[PDB]
Amino acid sequence: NNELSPVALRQMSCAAGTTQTACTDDNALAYYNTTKGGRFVLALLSDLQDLKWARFPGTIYTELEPPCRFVTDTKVKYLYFIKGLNNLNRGMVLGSLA
Amino acid sequence: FSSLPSYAAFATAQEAYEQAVANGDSEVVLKKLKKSLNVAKSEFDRDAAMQRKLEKMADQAMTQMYKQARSEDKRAKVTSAMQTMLFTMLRKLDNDALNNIINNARDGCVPLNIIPLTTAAKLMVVIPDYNTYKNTCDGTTFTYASALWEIQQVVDADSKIVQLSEISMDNSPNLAWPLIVTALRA
Amino acid sequence: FSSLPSYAAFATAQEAYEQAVANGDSEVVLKKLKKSLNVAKSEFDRDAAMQRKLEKMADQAMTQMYKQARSEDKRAKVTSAMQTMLFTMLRKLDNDALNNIINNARDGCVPLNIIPLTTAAKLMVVIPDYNTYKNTCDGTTFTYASALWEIQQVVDADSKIVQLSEISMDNSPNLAWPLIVTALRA
Amino acid sequence: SKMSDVKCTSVVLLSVLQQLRVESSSKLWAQCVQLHNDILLAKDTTEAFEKMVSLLSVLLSMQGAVDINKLCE
Amino acid sequence: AQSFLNRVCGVSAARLTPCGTGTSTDVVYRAFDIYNDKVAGFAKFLKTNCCRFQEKDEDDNLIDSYFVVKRHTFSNYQHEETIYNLLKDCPAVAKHDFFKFRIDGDMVPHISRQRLTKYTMADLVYALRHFDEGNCDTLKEILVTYNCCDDDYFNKKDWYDFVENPDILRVYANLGERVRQALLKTVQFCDAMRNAGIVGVLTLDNQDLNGNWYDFGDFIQTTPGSGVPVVDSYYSLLMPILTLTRALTAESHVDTDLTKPYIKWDLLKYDFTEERLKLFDRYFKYWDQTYHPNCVNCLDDRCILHCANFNVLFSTVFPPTSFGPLVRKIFVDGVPFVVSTGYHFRELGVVHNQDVNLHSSRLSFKELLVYAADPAMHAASGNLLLDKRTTCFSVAALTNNVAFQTVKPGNFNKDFYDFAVSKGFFKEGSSVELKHFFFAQDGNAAISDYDYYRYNLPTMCDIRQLLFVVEVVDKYFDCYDGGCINANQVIVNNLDKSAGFPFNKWGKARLYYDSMSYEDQDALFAYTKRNVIPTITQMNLKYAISAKNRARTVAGVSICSTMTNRQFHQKLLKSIAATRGATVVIGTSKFYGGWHNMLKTVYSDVENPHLMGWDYPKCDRAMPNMLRIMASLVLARKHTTCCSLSHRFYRLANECAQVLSEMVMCGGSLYVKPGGTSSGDATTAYANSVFNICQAVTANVNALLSTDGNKIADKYVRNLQHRLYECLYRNRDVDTDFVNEFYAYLRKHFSMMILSDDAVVCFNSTYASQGLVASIKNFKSVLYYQNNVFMSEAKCWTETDLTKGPHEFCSQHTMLVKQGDDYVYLPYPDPSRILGAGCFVDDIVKTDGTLMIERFVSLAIDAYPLTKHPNQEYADVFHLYLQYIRKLHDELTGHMLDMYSVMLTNDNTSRYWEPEFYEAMYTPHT
RNA sequence: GUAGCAUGCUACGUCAUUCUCCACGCGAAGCA
RNA sequence: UCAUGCUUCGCGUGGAGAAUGACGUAGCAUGCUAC
Ligand SMILES: O=c1ccn([C@@H]2O[C@H](COP(=O)(O)CP(=O)(O)OP(=O)(O)O)[C@@H](O)[C@H]2O)c(=O)[nH]1
Ligand SMILES: O=c1ccn([C@@H]2O[C@H](COP(=O)(O)CP(=O)(O)OP(=O)(O)O)[C@@H](O)[C@H]2O)c(=O)[nH]1
Ligand SMILES: [Mg+2]
Ligand SMILES: [Mg+2]
Ligand SMILES: [Mg+2]
Ligand SMILES: [Mg+2]
Ligand SMILES: [Zn+2]
Ligand SMILES: [Zn+2]
Incomplete structure (x- = not known):
């Protein structure tokens, strides 16, 4: 009995946009490893289909990735992995449901 | 060295002491001669210490010079051996x-x-x-x-x-x- | 380190000090004798130290020469001594x-x-x-x-x-x- | 004390063999080394006293090398 | 129950013996890789609730095909059915039946998996990793079942030993192709999961020994085409078995089938990067972390280890002649040379020198030193060699005749023996008897000790556990300070040692250390930071007193490697040697109360303390290359300020090229060293200490993760285990908080004292009993699966009474004695060792006592603590030495007076035949 | 009161030995 | 042929500090001479 995410992955609200310009307004949910030093966001869940960059409190800009053809089961709300993500973190994002 | 540069004062002091012992002009002049002998002896000892120090430094310097020369000779003798070994194996290759x-x-x-x-x-x-x-x-x-x-x-x-x-x-x-x-x- | 020209002199000076203290003579003469005894003791100490250093060097050389002499006797009679030892031990075993x-x-x-x-x-x-x-x-x-x-x-x-x-x-x-x-x- | 006397005697015997230039025969030297090492780490005196006989036979085979008459005076 | 047996068979047309009772269950002990929110680890749990029906052949001959029926809850039955209908088409998936059978009045849902073996792959990995000689039934059954050997093969004893019975390697290698087929089938399963959009964790316990996968309890469904098979624990746990069973030996044949002939690779081919990537894609397709075939491109130490693990695995498929220096022709003054301009490491891939000079003009002293040290010109000019006396690769014969080197019997000091026997020694039935001698060897001695390097095998490590263990082990070296130093600051102890081959032809180390100035030495050290200098390490034959007849050899490394390794580890290691109270006790004396302080530091506030110790059987000749590379890497952690990553990598490459897999000149011929470590390099003892600490930490990790987890009644330790699993198999980056926490836990409950391959441990007996810290068996298992060595009871010891001290440490026994209203621990040696030192000597001069009186004073100093022993003969040893010293002084005085008639007895010598001079050596005031 | 001489103490310069710390040279022993 | 390190013992040489002894140059206490 080996499980993906025994404890649901923590999440919070954040801001993101196509470029580094539309990060002022928070419009997306992000899953982050709870106690990985500070905060480390693994994925971004939003009801948008053009996001390419995300920003978080100093301010740090994180490169996004194109979303697989995903109709996530809570619409066309996609699920954007951070570039360079490993398989285990990809599983937890989906193992913690989406 | 017995004939150090400042040995004249010591020689004069010794001669004056011998003369005073033979004659003994007076007590006050005897004390003055003793003071002169003491100052001459102090200067002579200072000079002797300086000369001994210089001799030791010179001997050490010459020993170091000889050791360095021998080391360079050994280096020049092993360089030729390494060259000869490398050029011997080189001619041993089937080109x-x-x-x-x-x-x-x-x-x-x-x-x-x-x-x-x-x-x-x-x-x-x-x-x-x-x-x-x-x-x-x-x-x-x-x-x-x-x-x-x-x-x-x-x-x-x-x-x-x-x-x-x-x-x-x-x-x-x-x-x-x-x-x-x-x-x-x- | 007795028998040295200094020690004996110093010894006599010490005797000269033994009499004066018993004589109760003038202070100037007493201090003169004390000064003479001190200088004689210093001279004797110098000579004794030099003699002891020379004796130390001589003993070191003697022991080194003994070591050198016996090492060659060990390395030169190895063949005969080892065979003699072998047959002595075989005689002792008595098998x-x-x-x-x-x-x-x-x-x-x-x-x-x-x-x-x-x-x-x-x-x-x-x-x-x-x-x-x-x-x-x-x-x-x-x-x-x-x-x-x-x-x-x-x-x-x-x-x-x-x-x-x-x-x-x-x-x-x-x-x-x-x-x-x-x-x-x- | 006859068990520590055969080991010392074996050491001395192989030393005598070595300086007699038995090391120039690889086969004989190998046999001598085997016997010496077996004697050193033996536990029964009777076995060591047979290996010692073998080793001393090796030495006695070289009649010209040593003069048994003088040594065994 | 007979109706049930006719629906488990279904329509596959089989015949079932109810090995497991039909409607009842089957319970056994099986290894699982479990991770819940409650429990974690890789431990043998109690499998239950399953009914296992065996299958009969056409003839009534039972085969290892089992129908495993299980009762599942409706909600998980539906989920497994809908996750199997998607993977049903993959060949690497065992069949399932998914029926409903009436029990009582309720249609209970049953899931039936068809034609599974008896044991899974988790059982094989657990059996081969947690190996207990007295408990091997699950491994013997696996070996016999798959025709690896015969059931009678285990009547032989030491059949499991890699040294006493080297044929066990063949028996294990008979499992190679089964493991390889399992790897291929798991790659197929991963492809199927990705194409069907299934997300889940692959564990060894869900794959039987035919490769089929059969459990889908914790898999989830996403959009097709984007699935995430999480294979990190699977491969990481399986890694050691891959080299133990030689699973990739089928890659050495044409068409990758064991029946066809081997592959005849091009002889001039040295760059196998394409083949390495092909193998990685074939067997580790879904291993997320990036693989660098050539470790030149690696990002740091943790990335060098990861890629060198795979290179170790993949370098067993390629010809042995392609590994080594890469030679090239260069013209100097118009004369063509043949010099090394690179290297092909079995672990580090291809490395190319950056300062290769073509069409030069002259060779300075540094350049002559570099060209005269590499084996390029030596081997390229010698004649071919085929040495059938050893299995190690033979390169060339430099001379026309082979050299046979013997060992001399040793000399006998008969005077001391006669004196001792006159003092009632060496009698029959005495507790003290001669056991240490000088043993003689025939011509084949060095080449016979090389056949012990034959014991080094390619070992692939569990890389995730290795990385965590490296992070924890680096904390044992935090109090030290190191870095690079100039030539001005290097301290050479003895300059009258040999300089190695070919430099011993012209002088000692002094010649070269005083020939080339500090500028030349600095230039050479800077050169080694961006180029590789292969060197030849001579094989010297020792001449020393020992208790067993082994021809012990050492490695006379060249002078270039020695200089360039000193300018690193001199400053790294002087701090280790100058530190008191650390785990590594190198540099600490046993005199003036040092032994007592060391023991009291080892006993540091452990709660229920027991003592344990060990010694590795063949430390240098059986050490895997991975752990030697690790030891070199953690020693270089101190160069964060003075060296960049490229410089560090090239220094590691130099070390590997001249002390890991160099060319050794043994008797006028060049051989290739399989691996291990060269005892005689600049970091012998310290690298051994690092290796020892790494093995101990690995043992503790395995002990803590192999515990049930539900049975641990302490919450803190249970959480520690749960997080220890995460920090290994679910974290890619080091977590410093938990590394510190685990280091503190180990220091509190597992206190070590390390000196090279010698170790003493004070451990909490209660935790070790409960499995929460390493016992002496968790350390034998680690040596078996990570060192290719079986450690017998003759090398390990335990002590439940710690008022007696360690049984043995550095060949010294401990004794609790009294000296001045205080009880202190004193070290005393084996009396036979001291008596043998007295009786047998190296030179013939040493058999003359009067010339060697300090020789006996040193032995009396060593043997003084025997005076406190309850056994009387042990005290008589020291008294014998004192009386013999007095006799020697009397004889010397007599000889001096007789020959040179002057007396020099003096009074300072009288203190040598008195016990006070030796009492003062063990009293704490200096 | 000033200067010189005598006795007794403190501060600078040179030697006599007596124990500590280090710097290297030689020999030796144990250890991994 | 005889490696890398650690520890200790003995002897010898060089340097730096402390205690006791000896001799010039200065400071303080008393006495004697010139005034
Ligand atoms: O919460 C749990 C789950 C499991 N276990 C232990 O772990 C063992 C294996 O549990 P499991 O889910 O792996 C069986 P299952 O999935 O049907 O079959 P396979 O593994 O063969 O695929 C159980 O016996 C039990 O001792 C536990 O303590 N707590
Ligand atoms: O003079 C020596 C002795 C040892 N060693 C190092 O210390 C390790 C262990 O030394 P050891 O006395 O335990 C004999 P080991 O090799 O274990 O074999 P056995 O147990 O079969 O006797 C060696 O590997 C080597 O790296 C060295 O440098 N020089
Ligand atoms: Mg499981
Ligand atoms: Mg199941
Ligand atoms: Mg060992
Ligand atoms: Mg050991
Ligand atoms: Zn890499
Ligand atoms: Zn550095």
Whole structure:
């Protein structure tokens, strides 16, 4: 009995946009490893289909990735992995449901 | 040194003390002569200490100079030995086969382990027991490394010539194993 | 470090100090004598220290020379000393087999190969004279190393075989000694 | 004390063999080394006293090397 | 129950023996890789609730095909059915039946998996990793079942030993192709999961020994085409078995089938990067972390280890002649040389020198030193060699005759022996008897000790556990300070040692250390930071007194490597040697109360303390290359300020090229060293200490993760285990908080004292009993699966009474004695060692007592603590030495007076035959 | 009161030995 | 042929500090001479 995410992955609200310009307004949910030093966001869940960059409190800009053809089961709300993500973190994002 | 530069004062002091002992002008003049002797002796001791220090420094410097010269001589003598060794092995290379293999290389770079295996003109096989001899080097001509080698000379552990007719299972206990067989590439 | 020209003088000065303190003379003379004693003691101490240093160096040289002398005597008589020690220890052991083989070798009945230890193996031994043969060889049995060996061949001095019935003091002069006896352990 | 006397004697005997130039015969030297090492780490005196006989036979085989008459005076 | 047996068979047309009772269950002990929110680890749990029906052949001959029926809850039955209908088409998936059978009045849902073996792959990995000689039934059954050996093969004893019975390697290698087929089938399964959009964790316990996968309890469904098979624990746990069973031996044949002939690779081919990537894609397709075939491109130490693990695995498929220096022709003054301009490491891939000079003009002293040290010109000019006396690769024969080197019997000091026997020694039935001698060797001694390097095998490590263990082990070296130093600051102890081959032909180390100035040495050290200098390490034969007849050899490394390794580890290691109270006790004396302080530091506040110790059987000749590389890497952690990553990598490459896999000149011939470590390099003892600490930490990790987890009644330790699993198999980056926490836990409950390969441990007996810290068996298992060595009871010891001290440490026994209203621990040696030192000597001069009186003073100093022993003969040893010293002084005085008639007895010598001079050596005031 | 001489103490310069710390040279022993 | 390190013992040489002894140049206490 080996499980993906025994404890649901923590999440919070954040801001993101196509470029580094539309990060002022928070419009997306992000899953982050709870106690990985500070905060480390693994994925971004939003009801948008053009996001390419995300920003978080100093301010740090994180490169996004194109979303697989995903109709996530809570619409066309996609699920954007951070570039360079490993398989285990990809599983937890989906193992913690989406 | 007895005749140090400031020995005149000490000599005068000693002579004056001898004269005073012989004569003894007075107590006050005797005390003055004692003071002069003491100051001259202090100066003489200062000069002697300085001279001894300088002598020690000079001796150490010369010893270091000789040691450095000998070290450079040894360096110049080992440089020639290393050059001679490198240029001896260089003339020992079989240039034709070495060039042939080097050229075939894509970038002129090849593993070291194949230079003897593909260019060496002599093979040495060390055979512990008779079964190994039967398996590998049986006969007067054998095959190894995709090459045909013709046996040239077999010696025993004592480095004594062993005839190929003496290497048999019956004579095996009578031989000084391991046998070293040197063969020439055909 | 007595007997030095300084020590003795100092000693006398000390005596000169013993009288003055008992004499209760003037203070100036007392301090003069004290100063003389101090300078004499300093001179004696200097000379004694120098003498002790020289004696130390002499003793070091002497011990080094002794070491050098004895090292060569150890390295030059290694062969004779080791053999003498070996045979002393063998005499001390007092084993029947060791003593028997040593005595036989003393009489000339040396072996030709290593004495076997297996249940049955070959042993070739020299027999210089008929006296040793009768002492050891009786019938087909041979006594060596406190064990019985079955004789299996008696080679003549000319590499010719000899029958066990040919050997006897009556016929011994005719034969050609030494006789190589081959036997198997029983 | 006859068990520590055969080991010291074996050491001395192989030392005498070595300086007698038995090391130039690989087969004989190998046999001598085997006997010496077996004697050193033996536990029964009777076995050591047979290996010692073998080793001393090796030494006595070289009649020209040593003079048994003088040494065993 | 007979109706049930006719629906488990279904329509596959089989015949079932109810090995497991039909409607009842089957319970056994099986290894699982479990991770819940409650429990974690890789431990043998109690499998239950399953009914296992075996299958009969056409003839009534039972085969290892089992129908495993299980009762599942409706909600998980539906989920498994809908996750199997998607993977049903993959060949690497065992069949399932998914029926409903009536029990009582309720249609219970049953899931039936068809034609599974008896044991899974988790059982094989657990059995081969947690190996207990007295408990091997699950491994013997696996070996016999798959025709690896015969059931009678285990009647032989030491059949499991890699040294006493080297044929066990063949028996294990008979499992190679089964493991390889399992790897291929798991790659197929991963492809199927990705194409069907299934997300889940692959564990060894869900794959039987035919490769089929059969459990889908915790898999989830996403959009097709984007699935995430999480294989990190699977491969990481399986890694050691891959080299133990030689699973990739089928890659050495044409068409990758064991029946066809081997592959005849091009002899001049040295760059196998394409083949390495092909193998990685074939067997580790879904291993997320990036793989660098050539470690030149690696990002740091943790990335060098990761890629070198795979290179170790993949370098067993390639010809042995392609590894080594890469030679090239260069023209100097118009004369063509042949010099090394690179290297092909079995672990580090291809490395190319950056300062290769073509068409030069002259060779300075540094350049001559570099060209005269590499084996390029030596091997390229010698004649070919085929040495049948050893299995190690033979390169060339430099001379025309082979050299046979013997060992001399040793010399006998008869005067001392006679004195001792006169003092009632060496009698029959004495507790003290001669056991240490000088043993002689025949001509084949060095080449016979090389056949012990034959014991080094390619070992692939569990890389995730290795990385965590490295992070924890680096904390044992935090109090030290190190870095690079100039030539001005290097301290050479003895300059009258050999300089190695070919430098021993012209002088000692002094010649070269005083020939080349500090500028030349700095230039050479800077050169080694961006180029590789191969060197030849001579094989010297020792001449020393020992208790067993082994021809011990050492490695006379060249002078270039020694200089360039000193300018690193001199400053790294002087701090290790100058530190008191650390785990590594190198540099600490046993005199003046040092031994007592060391023991009291080892006993540091452990709660229920027991003592344990060990010694590795063949430390240098059986050490895997991975752990030697690790030891070199953690020693270089101190160069964060003075060296960049490229410089560090090239220094590692140099070390590997001249002390890991160099060319050794043994008797006038060059051989290739399989691996291990060269005892005689600049970091012998310290690298051994690092290796020892790494093995101990690995043992503790395995002990803590192999515990059940539900049975641990302490919450803190249970959480520690749960997080220890995460920090290994679910974290890619080091977590410093938990590394510190685990280091503190180990220091509290597992206190070590390390000196090279010698170790003493004070451990909490209660935790070790409960399995919460390493016992002496968790350390034998680690050596078995990570060192290719079986450690017998003759090398390990335990002590439940710690008022007696360690049984042995550095060949010294401990004794609790009294000296001045205080009880202190004193070290005493084996009396036979001291008596043998007295009786047998190296030179013939040493057999003259009067010339060697300090020689006996040193032995009396060493043997003084025997005076406190309850056994009387042990005290008589020291008294014998004192009386013999007095006799020697008397003889020396007599000789001096007789020959040179001047007396020099003095009074300072009288203190040598008195016990006070030796009492003061073990009293704490200096 | 100032200067010089005498006795007794403190501060600078040179030697006599006596123990500590280090710097190297030689020999030796144990250890991994 | 005889490696890398650690520890200790003995002897010898060089340097730096402390205690006791000896001799000039200065500071303080008393006495004597010139005034
Ligand atoms: O919460 C849990 C789950 C499991 N276990 C232990 O772990 C063992 C294996 O549990 P499991 O889910 O792996 C069986 P299952 O999935 O049907 O079969 P396979 O593994 O063969 O695929 C159980 O016996 C039990 O001792 C536990 O303590 N707590
Ligand atoms: O003079 C020595 C002795 C040892 N060593 C190092 O210390 C390690 C262990 O040394 P050891 O006395 O335990 C014999 P080991 O090799 O274990 O073999 P056995 O147990 O079969 O006797 C060696 O590997 C080597 O790196 C060294 O440098 N020099
Ligand atoms: Mg499981
Ligand atoms: Mg199940
Ligand atoms: Mg060991
Ligand atoms: Mg040990
Ligand atoms: Zn890498
Ligand atoms: Zn550095």
